[PDB]
Write a protein that binds this ligand. Structure first.
Ligand SMILES: NC(=O)c1ccc[n+]([C@@H]2O[C@H](COP(=O)([O-])OP(=O)(O)OC[C@H]3O[C@@H](n4cnc5c(N)ncnc54)[C@H](OP(=O)(O)O)[C@@H]3O)[C@@H](O)[C@H]2O)c1
Ligand SMILES: NC(=O)c1ccc[n+]([C@@H]2O[C@H](COP(=O)([O-])OP(=O)(O)OC[C@H]3O[C@@H](n4cnc5c(N)ncnc54)[C@H](OP(=O)(O)O)[C@@H]3O)[C@@H](O)[C@H]2O)c1
Lengths: 347, 345
């Protein structure tokens, strides 16, 4: 019995992942062995494998990817409430069960080995049980670990969204696509921005978002957000531009609204760095640095997704052979994808 | 019959003129307040000196946000107020609940303020002083701006839990009002200052837990983490703005709140810090705080009264022309600890 894993040691490109056959891991008494069946990628995996993840330290001989779902294949001798065959997701963190994330030491695919392998030994306390009536496949289930957890934290982990409020999503990446599908099933009005009109059309057609705005051709986007919200502005902004876009974002937000700061993909120079304390003081709105999401939160969002039959959107699902895995990573890097890229470890 | 102060040339508070006016008559929804006590705020210097951001200020302005006194007359449609009731006036006439939506009805800027013997105000803007409150009118008045702002910071969004740590910057109105409220709600308090004598005074008078001189120790975020066993402050009552925000962020615990309230520090464009990046790293929040609603200020008032909090007034001046000018010169000096009072009487 073999565990086929991918590991990287030279973090200058995902093309330094090496397919290895290892012995089946034994579990410690408090662990469970997960047969991984579905995985999805994140920008984080590209940043880590390519050596531009400044948030935290990354281990040597790393198995990448935070996102995995599958079934229990073995159970340690102290473990109570998990059986072989049980269908599961792994929490993005081993240790962040509730409250704020205190480090990245135990984050899958970074501080500890991630999900791009057939088998993983993990602490049972990291396990999220997939409700029994859930009809999603394993890749869809995996999709919830990083983007689902993050979005639910931004919308429900500090001051919670109310039905009827407006959420603005920057770009058409995994955070936004996962976000629009959850927010729309929670009764939000949704707005999405993009550098591409083709993408905006696609997002509008598949997900039924209420308004689209091209931020490349229409950099005065705050003003449009205001037109579509009766002059009030958006109640939540899922902010992935960082300083480069924070001025527009602030002016697009209602007073009393929330800007969930999540990424910083946008360019900025010191000369144009906006005065954020002053802008936020004038708008009367909040900013919050969002850091994934705890197990408690993520479980609620999982329960919602199952109970209401939200069907996470998967752009393309690849197999587990080397050429397939690189084609999936390549697609994640290109920026041409809408939402999630998936990998079927089994089928 | 009504002595008021008005300013129309907003280049200095020395342009306020004492006028004797007829006693205002009241519209049907209004009440006439005999103003007994007033307090000053930096906002009044900013407005009288012409350096007040956003807003737009009326001509012929009675300045000041803060007032308390007694109902002298009642309009014909008013139900739950009678002559002799002790009252505070809400900072805005319109902001009863929810977030502030403009400053058109803000006392001492959009509408006439409290530096006058009598004031006609809509009834819906009145906050009844509890019957048992044993505070003077000047103390009562000090709850209007700084008190409403601090309550909003700590209880208006995600509420303070007992035992959490609050950081206050400097020893002005917001900080001292804040210290007194946070202490009486069971917070650990830390106070920062440019002077050790102000710090000794503050620690002794108010029982502040930890003090830090931001001139002696300009890496004050470090001192805050040292005093919270590496955790950080749960709330920062932030009054410096961009100038200090990097430090404040580095002082804040993961999941903590930075109440952005003021803009007093100098900043140069080349020092402007990347706030979203720093916030994302710390995993903390920033929030622009715009005074506070009547609903919330009411709660703060009930708290002050039920728990016998005694707002500190550094000095109270009389209502003569020379005394008013002196009160404004003290507020503008920076030598005050907390609040400057005017006994309209
Ligand atoms: N804080 C956390 O816990 C957390 C969790 C997950 C992700 N993140 C971070 O958040 C960001 C998004 O992650 P993801 O997986 O969604 O990434 P992704 O799928 O790579 O998203 C990339 C998309 O972002 C959009 N974009 C790029 N520059 C933009 C700009 N200036 N303004 C608006 N949109 C822009 C583009 O959309 P268009 O092509 O449509 O323009 C692009 O295709 C990354 O920086 C990631 O590191 C953070
Ligand atoms: N958003 C709102 O609704 C709202 C409400 C009230 C006030 N404010 C604003 O909040 C600020 C505070 O007003 P206030 O009435 O409390 O002020 P104040 O009584 O005039 O406070 C002045 C004091 O602040 C301290 N200070 C000045 N620069 C500082 C710096 N760089 N770092 C730390 N402390 C500094 C000084 O104390 P030390 O000498 O001890 O350091 C000084 O004596 C003002 O900017 C005002 O416009 C806003």
């Amino acid at each position: 019995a073999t565990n086929t894993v991918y590991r990287i040691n030279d973090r200058t490109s995902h093309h330094n992942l090496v397919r290895l056959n290892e012995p089946l891991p034994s579990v410690h008494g408090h662990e469970v062995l997960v047969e991984i069946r579905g995985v999805t990628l994140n920008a984080r995996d590209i940043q880590i494998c390519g050596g531009f993840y400044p948030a935290a330290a990354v281990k040597d001989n790393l198995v990448p990817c935070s996102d995995g779902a599958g079934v229990i294949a073995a159970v340690g001798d102290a473990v109570n409430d998990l059986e072989i065959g049980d269908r599961v997701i792994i929490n993005i963190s081993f240790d962040n069960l509730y409250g704020p994330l205190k480090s990245q030491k135990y984050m899958l695919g970074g501080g500890v080995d991630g999900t791009l392998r057939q088998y993983a030994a993990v602490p049972a306390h990291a396990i999220i049980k997939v409700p029994v009536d859930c009809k999603l496949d394993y890749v869809q289930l995996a999709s919830l670990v990083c983007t689902g957890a993050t979005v639910w934290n931004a919308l429900y982990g500090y001051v919670p969204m109310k039905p009827g409020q407006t959420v603005l999503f920057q770009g058409t990446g995994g955070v936004s696509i996962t976000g629009v599908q959850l927010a729309k099933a929670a009764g939000a009005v949704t707005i999405v921005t993009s550098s591409s009109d083709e993408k905006l059309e696609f997002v509008k057609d598949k997900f039924g978002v209420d308004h689209v705005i091209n931020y490349k051709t229409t950099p005065n986007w705050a003003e449009e957000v205001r037109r579509f919200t009766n002059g009030e502005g958006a109640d939540y902004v899922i902010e992935i531009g960082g300083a480069g876009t924070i001025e527009q974002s602030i002016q697009a937000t209602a007073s009393g609204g929330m800007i969930a700061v999540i990424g910083y993909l946008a360019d900025i120079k010191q000369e144009n760095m906006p005065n954020v304390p002053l802008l936020a003081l004038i708008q009367g709105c909040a900013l919050r640095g969002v850091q994934a999401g705890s197990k408690q939160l993520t479980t609620e969002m999982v329960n919602f997704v199952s109970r209401k039959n939200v069907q996470p959107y998967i752009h393309k699902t690849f197999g587990f052979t080397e050429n397939e895995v690189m084609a999936a990573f390549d697609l994640q890097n290109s920026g041409k994808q809408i939402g999630k890229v998936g990998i079927a470890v089994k089928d």
